[PDB]
Amino acid sequence: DMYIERAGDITWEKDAEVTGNSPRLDVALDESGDFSLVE
Amino acid sequence: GETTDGVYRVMTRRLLGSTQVGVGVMQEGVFHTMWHVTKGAALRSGEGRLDPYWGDVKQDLVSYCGPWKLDAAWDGLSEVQLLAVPPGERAKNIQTLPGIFKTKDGDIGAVALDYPAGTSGSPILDKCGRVIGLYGNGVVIKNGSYVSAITQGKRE
Numbered sequence: 001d002m003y004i005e006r007a008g009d010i011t012w013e014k015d016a017e018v019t020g021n022s023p024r025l026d027v028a029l030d031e032s033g034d035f036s037l038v039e
Numbered sequence: 040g041e042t043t044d045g046v047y048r049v050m051t052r053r054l055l056g057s058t059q060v061g062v063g064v065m066q067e068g069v070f071h072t073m074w075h076v077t078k079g080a081a082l083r084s085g086e087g088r089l090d091p092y093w094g095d096v097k098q099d100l101v102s103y104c105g106p107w108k109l110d111a112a113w114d115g116l117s118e119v120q121l122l123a124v125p126p127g128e129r130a131k132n133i134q135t136l137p138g139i140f141k142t143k144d145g146d147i148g149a150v151a152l153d154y155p156a157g158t159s160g161s162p163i164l165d166k167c168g169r170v171i172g173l174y175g176n177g178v179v180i181k182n183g184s185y186v187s188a189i190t191q192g193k194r195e
């Protein structure tokens with residue numbers, strides 16, 4: 001059986017760690033909810 | 040049981056010890072998560088029981104106790120924060136500028152951050168703290184890194 005536990009409030013934090021890129025990707029979404037790269 | 044608004048861990052006791060399979064958002068008395076996390080199964084909150092209300096495998100989303108309540112959208116320009124809730128680790132805000140997933144049905148935002156599979160369902164927020172989507176369904180690119188869609192449902 002699955003259960004839930006609280007982990008925190010939903011708030012924006014000023015001065016949080018800024019990381020990660022912004023790629024533009026061509027993708028396809030199948031009937032099973034799975035994304036794939038189109039090339 | 041616990042109906043307070045906020046971010047929650049989705050746990051199971053079926054495997055070894057206690058395992059975190061995903062994360063969700065409680066908002067307006069409704070628990071929102073990714074379909075692949077629970078597979079539509081019922082959830083427990085202390086003594087309380089949460090039953091599935093709406094779900095769709097293609098959108099990879101599921102709501103408990105009521106219809107999908109989250110409707111805010113990424114503006115296409117601004118930086119966002121992934122409120123990452125990793126297994127056995129504290130909730131942490133990570134700010135990033137989203138990329139794009141171009142599909143035959145239109146563009147979706149994409150957050151390029153790598154977290155274990157048990158982080159699926161962590162909310163993505165705008166500068167006002169509104170949930171613009173959930174992290175945890177995406178693709179693995181050339182260098183073996185993960186890029187998640189900014190998956191958002193439709194409010195009725």
Ligand SMILES: O=C(NC1CCOCC1)[C@H](Nc1ccc2c(c1)CNC2)c1cc(Cl)cc2[nH]ncc12
Binds near residue numbers: 032099154157
């Ligand atoms: O995106 C994922 N799955 C793949 C990634 C690329 O190949 C296709 C689907 C993981 N989640 C997941 C699993 C099962 C299903 C779905 C989503 C939707 N349909 C069923 C996933 C989450 C997270 Cl947070 C990190 C991760 N790293 N690698 C994987 C991964």
